[PDB]
RNA sequence: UAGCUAGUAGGUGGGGUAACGGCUCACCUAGGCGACGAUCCCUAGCUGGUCUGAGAGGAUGACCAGCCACACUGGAACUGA
RNA sequence: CGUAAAGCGCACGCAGGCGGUUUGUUAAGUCAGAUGUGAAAUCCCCGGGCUCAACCUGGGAACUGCAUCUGAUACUGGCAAGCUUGAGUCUCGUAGAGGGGGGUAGAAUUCCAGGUGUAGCGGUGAAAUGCGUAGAGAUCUGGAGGAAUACCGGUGGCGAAGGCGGCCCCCUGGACGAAGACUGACGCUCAGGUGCGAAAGCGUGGGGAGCAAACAGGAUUAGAUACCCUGGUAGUCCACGCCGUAAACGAUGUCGACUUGGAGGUUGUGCCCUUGAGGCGUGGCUUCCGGAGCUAACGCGUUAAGUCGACCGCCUGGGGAGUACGGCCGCAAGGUUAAAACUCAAAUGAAUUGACGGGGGCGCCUUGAAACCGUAGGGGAACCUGCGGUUGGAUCACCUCCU
């Protein structure tokens, strides 16, 4: 769930990147609150300072050109030591790691999953679900996090 | 039904007391009479007295000092719900000291003030002052 | 709810004498005759809730007074309960 | 009448669509801009109707829009599906959001187009929805979702707090999709049928249906066809309706 | 958490202990227990005390003293006062 | 515990609690005294000792208790005896939509059968759907059938509550007054328990006039699911089962005693009536004012929400939630008992002042301005509809300060 993503994306990318962190993921929730929240990651490393810096800028820069601000907050994230992940490149860093994911698609030989990453293919995810193996598309699934594992 | 015929007499002084009335009356018992003669031997009321044989009545003649009820509080403690025993130190002090409690004690009721100088706890009845 | 006649039967028999109404047995007598009675009124009046009301309070009063005399005078209660054939 | 504000269940619902070519997509109700857009977008090209002329010139005269839509200004409950799902090529994907009055009449001209008719995709009010989806054996259950569930299958998209909606009214409501079964898990020989004895049964939901279909069927019908007379409207899956209405057209 | 219980409850007789006793065993009776909460399940070693509280209360049982139980886990039994 | 949370929808009744009055007796409770015990340490008091203190320590007090013995006899309990005031029986009347059962009447609607008759009727804001030339509509007669009781009728009666209304009969419950007579504390309350319990709905078999959820069709509206109309099923009725809820609310548990007045209503009764009206009384029931007192305030106020006694029920911030789960119960609906996580700094009652505002009257006084409950069904909505109950018939709230 976002607005405008690609623009949202680019308008973050510009604080990111003069700052040279680099964007993992974004997603916004709509309830009590409605907010935003953003995965940066930097391999030197993100301390809550860098979340700090990021976040007073975006504060900023985003909300003087708003295309929405209803009930509006965000915050900026290092991800998780179990961690959200997005992409076709993300997922092959992580081949022969477990995950969990959850999906558009929502029917039996149930669409929501514990897997170990077999492959990735440029349109899917190829994951040692249930100790079985199955393929999901990057457009049939809508959010997965990797390593679990870690509690 | 009616279940405190002494209750009902206190009450019965009060409500009196608090409408203006120079008497109350009641359907008299051997233990109301007891009750209101130590309340005249301290002087709460003017007097008391029983007429008539058979079914007995006994009136007692509320007393008022200048402008105003001479008892101002008067309630009782052995609820037949619960009753009330005291050691002869036990005995509690009404007022500091300045009001009554009424003992029923094994040598027959007094005030608190007699009780404990005769030693003999007992079971209390109430309070006046 | 009784004929003049069926109570002086019923207290000339159970009753001390025609000055007495109201003891015990004369009360426990007529209220039991009338309880009998009333059978016959419920075995077609099924749907008579607002009557049956007082037929229960006829046969709890009954009962109270019963037990009232069965601490008073067993005596009296079992030639009494006998008479009726009461605690059928 | 209400149509959405925020772009994040707004992009949430046109995303959950998947709208691209390879598919004979027609939008219905096309109302503001910012929802018809993204749409109008994905797809090269896409057909609309809109039931307000008005609307219908304001967006024609749009030129993002316009330019990339065939565009249609009429009562939906004329419009000739069956002949567009031809001009489309193949049966169609239709979509979008309404004042729903006419929600109720949607669903039956729908209907009349099961063939003509890839799959649906529309918000609709809490309630209704969760009716249309109910289960055979609950009380939000009932004829309507019995009409709906016979004709396609049925699944909610996602669901949406009333503070998203332009003027945003008290009542939740979800995106719901359905598909016109390709080859109907229960057969029947007429819909006549089942749309009388489930209004039938429904009308008299409260009494066993000894006392419903069985003012109709026998009990030794009802238990010949192995259904207990002494339950009630709503214990009865569509199967076993179907089964009735086979009975009813073919004992007949 | 409502019903519980067949050595169960009681009896006789045999056996048994340092000692009384279903302690146990034969027979015999049909008892015995429980909504004055048995049965069942969770939780806990107990107490003088300790802390708090105007008091009544509430909390709690580290240290020290008394009692209890346990000694790798689960079974027994030898010896001896 | 009227409205803030809280009095079971109502009643009866078992267990339990509580119980008038007089005399004897008992001595269980209770009281007094004694005796044994209540480990020490700790605690407390009064001392002593470490230079003081903390700390240590002598002695006392304390250890509320338990047991036993001894007295005490008011009160309570037990026992025994009575008592008539509570309770209750009887005799004579009285008022009443109290209930159950069975007949029956005059209106009324619809319908059928004619008769006379003819272009309209019907409906609405207006329309349309509808009905009529096969004669409708209208109006006369005759017949059918189901339902309900115009008026009396009331700030009125009866009933535990739910509720009860044409008339007559039959069975039957309770109440109140009169005047005695009689029993002799027989009492009150009541957890479980038992039963009664509107409206809706269900069960089985009838009935179906009028009305009418649903439904159907015509209209209206930006849309209209509503509001309008023409239809119309269930249902509404009956017998026999069930459900067991209602704002089932006096939002006010039951019983008993007491405590200023005042104006009515209703229904007995006594005495006086000069009669007939009257006028002195005197019960019962009931309505509205209002004193004291009470109450957050509103208000309540001898029919308390005052003053009190006995017992029962119920509440412990707001939401989550009377919701989950389990048990029970129900034919099914559902009922019933009933959480918690989680979440919030409130939530709430009454009342004050501005807005109100739309005004309304005459710058001034000041208002032409439905909510719910239970239940059943529809279902673009919040919603719409039917049945019957309740009234709790509506607003909303910004620029600082010390003696
Ligand atoms: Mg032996
Ligand atoms: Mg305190
Ligand atoms: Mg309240
Ligand atoms: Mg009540
Ligand atoms: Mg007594
Ligand atoms: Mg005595
Ligand atoms: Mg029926
Ligand atoms: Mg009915
Ligand atoms: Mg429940
Ligand atoms: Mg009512």
Same mark, same amino acid.
């Given at each position: 769930?976002?607005?405008?993503?690609?623009?949202?994306?680019?308008?973050?990318?510009?604080?990111?990147?003069?700052?040279?962190?680099?964007?993992?993921?974004?997603?916004?929730?709509?309830?009590?609150?409605?907010?935003?929240?953003?995965?940066?990651?930097?391999?030197?490393?993100?301390?809550?300072?860098?979340?700090?810096?990021?976040?007073?800028?975006?504060? &900023? %820069?985003?909300?003087?050109?708003?295309?929405? @601000? =209803?009930?509006?907050?965000? +915050? *900026?994230?290092?991800?998780?030591?179990?961690?959200?992940?997005?992409?076709?490149?993300?997922?092959?860093?992580?081949?022969?790691?477990?995950?969990?994911?959850?999906?558009?698609?929502?029917?039996?030989?149930?669409?929501?999953?514990?897997?170990?990453?077999? &492959? %990735?293919?440029?349109?899917?995810?190829?994951? @040692? =679900?249930?100790?079985?193996? +199955? *393929?999901?598309?990057?457009?049939?699934?809508?959010?997965?996090?990797?390593?679990?594992?870690?509690? | 039904?009616?279940?405190?015929?002494?209750?009902?007499?206190?009450?019965?002084?009060?409500?009196?007391?608090?409408?203006?009335?120079?008497?109350?009356?009641?359907?008299?018992?051997?233990?109301?009479?007891?009750?209101?003669?130590?309340?005249?031997?301290?002087?709460?009321?003017?007097?008391?007295?029983?007429?008539?044989?058979?079914?007995?009545?006994?009136?007692?003649?509320?007393?008022?000092?200048?402008?105003?009820?001479?008892?101002?509080?008067?309630?009782?403690?052995?609820?037949?719900?619960?009753?009330?025993?005291?050691?002869?130190?036990?005995?509690?002090?009404?007022?500091?000291?300045?009001?009554?409690?009424?003992?029923?004690?094994?040598?027959?009721?007094?005030?608190?003030?007699?009780?404990?100088?005769?030693?003999?706890?007992?079971?209390?009845?109430?309070?006046?002052? | 709810?009784?004929?003049?006649?069926?109570?002086?039967?019923?207290?000339?028999?159970?009753?001390?004498?025609?000055?007495?109404?109201?003891?015990?047995?004369?009360?426990?007598?007529?209220?039991?005759?009338?309880?009998?009675?009333?059978?016959?009124?419920?075995?077609?009046?099924?749907?008579?809730?607002?009557?049956?009301?007082?037929?229960?309070?006829?046969?709890?009063?009954?009962?109270?007074?019963?037990?009232?005399?069965?601490?008073?005078?067993?005596?009296?209660?079992?030639?009494?309960?006998?008479?009726?054939?009461?605690?059928? | 009448?209400?149509?959405?504000?925020?772009?994040?269940?707004?992009?949430?619902?046109?995303?959950?669509?998947?709208?691209?070519?390879?598919?004979?997509?027609?939008?219905?109700?096309?109302?503001?801009?910012?929802?018809?857009?993204?749409?109008?977008?994905?797809?090269?090209?896409?057909?609309?109707?809109?039931?307000?002329?008005?609307?219908?010139?304001?967006?024609?005269?749009?030129?993002?829009?316009?330019?990339?839509?065939?565009?249609?200004?009429?009562?939906?409950?004329?419009?000739?599906?069956?002949?567009?799902?031809?001009?489309?090529?193949?049966?169609?994907?239709?979509?979008?959001?309404?004042?729903?009055?006419?929600?109720?009449?949607?669903?039956?001209?729908?209907?009349?187009?099961?063939?003509?008719?890839?799959?649906?995709?529309?918000?609709?009010?809490?309630?209704?929805?969760?009716?249309?989806?109910?289960?055979?054996?609950?009380?939000?259950?009932?004829?309507?979702?019995?009409?709906?569930?016979?004709?396609?299958?049925?699944?909610?998209?996602?669901?949406?707090?009333?503070?998203?909606?332009?003027?945003?009214?008290?009542?939740?409501?979800?995106?719901?999709?359905?598909?016109?079964?390709?080859?109907?898990?229960?057969?029947?020989?007429?819909?006549?049928?089942?749309?009388?004895?489930?209004?039938?049964?429904?009308?008299?939901?409260?009494?066993?249906?000894?006392?419903?279909?069985?003012?109709?069927?026998?009990?030794?019908?009802?238990?010949?066809?192995?259904?207990?007379?002494?339950?009630?409207?709503?214990?009865?899956?569509?199967?076993?309706?179907?089964?009735?209405?086979?009975?009813?057209?073919?004992?007949?």
């Amino acid at each position: 769930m976002s607005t405008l993503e690609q623009k949202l994306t680019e308008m973050i990318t510009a604080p990111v990147e003069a700052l040279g962190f680099e964007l993992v993921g974004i997603e916004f929730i709509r309830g009590r609150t409605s907010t935003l929240r953003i995965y940066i990651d930097s391999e030197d490393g993100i301390n809550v300072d860098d979340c700090a810096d990021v976040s007073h800028q975006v504060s &900023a %820069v985003l909300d003087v050109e708003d295309p929405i @601000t =209803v009930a509006y907050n965000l +915050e *900026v994230s290092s991800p998780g030591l179990d961690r959200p992940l997005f992409t076709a490149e993300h997922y092959a860093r992580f081949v022969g790691e477990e995950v969990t994911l959850v999906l558009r698609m929502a029917v039996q030989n149930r669409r929501k999953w514990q897997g170990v990453i077999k &492959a %990735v293919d440029g349109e899917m995810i190829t994951v @040692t =679900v249930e100790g079985k193996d +199955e *393929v999901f598309a990057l457009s049939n699934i809508q959010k997965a996090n990797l390593v679990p594992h870690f509690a | 039904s009616m279940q405190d015929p002494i209750a009902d007499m206190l009450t019965r002084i009060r409500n009196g007391q608090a409408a203006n009335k120079a008497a109350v009356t009641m359907p008299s018992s051997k233990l109301k009479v007891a009750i209101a003669n130590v309340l005249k031997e301290e002087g709460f009321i003017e007097d008391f007295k029983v007429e008539g044989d058979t079914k007995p009545e006994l009136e007692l003649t509320l007393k008022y000092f200048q402008g105003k009820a001479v008892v101002e509080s008067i309630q009782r403690v052995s609820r037949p719900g619960l009753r009330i025993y005291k050691r002869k130190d036990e005995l509690p002090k009404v007022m500091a000291g300045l009001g009554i409690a009424v003992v029923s004690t094994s040598k027959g009721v007094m005030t608190d003030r007699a009780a404990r100088q005769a030693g003999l706890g007992g079971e209390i009845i109430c309070y006046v002052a | 709810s009784l004929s003049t006649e069926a109570t002086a039967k019923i207290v000339s028999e159970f009753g001390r004498d025609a000055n007495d109404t109201g003891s015990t047995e004369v009360q426990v007598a007529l209220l039991t005759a009338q309880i009998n009675h009333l059978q016959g009124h419920f075995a077609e009046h099924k749907k008579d809730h607002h009557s049956r009301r007082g037929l229960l309070r006829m046969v709890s009063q009954r009962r109270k007074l019963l037990d009232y005399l069965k601490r008073k005078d067993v005596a009296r209660y079992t030639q009494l309960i006998e008479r009726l054939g009461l605690r059928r | 009448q209400n149509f959405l504000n925020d772009q994040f269940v707004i992009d949430s619902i046109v995303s959950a669509i998947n709208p691209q070519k390879g598919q004979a997509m027609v939008e219905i109700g096309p109302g503001l801009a910012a929802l018809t857009e993204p749409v109008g977008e994905r797809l090269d090209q896409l057909t609309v109707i809109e039931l307000d002329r008005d609307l219908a010139a304001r967006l024609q005269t749009h030129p993002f829009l316009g330019p990339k839509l065939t565009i249609y200004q009429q009562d939906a409950m004329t419009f000739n599906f069956g002949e567009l799902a031809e001009k489309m090529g193949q049966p169609l994907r239709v979509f979008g959001n309404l004042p729903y009055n006419i929600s109720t009449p949607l669903m039956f001209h729908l209907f009349s187009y099961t063939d003509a008719i890839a799959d649906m995709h529309f918000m609709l009010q809490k309630e209704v929805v969760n009716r249309l989806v109910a289960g055979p054996n609950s009380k939000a259950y009932g004829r309507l979702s019995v009409m709906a569930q016979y004709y396609c299958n049925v699944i909610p998209v996602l669901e949406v707090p009333p503070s998203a909606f332009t003027p945003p009214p008290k009542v939740d409501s979800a995106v719901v999709r359905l598909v016109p079964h390709a080859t109907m898990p229960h057969p029947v020989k007429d819909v006549r049928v089942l749309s009388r004895i489930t209004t039938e049964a429904f009308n008299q939901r409260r009494k066993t249906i000894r006392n419903s279909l069985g003012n109709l069927f026998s009990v030794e019908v009802l238990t010949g066809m192995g259904i207990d007379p002494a339950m009630r409207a709503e214990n009865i899956s569509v199967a076993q309706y179907c089964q009735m209405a086979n009975y009813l057209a073919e004992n007949a």
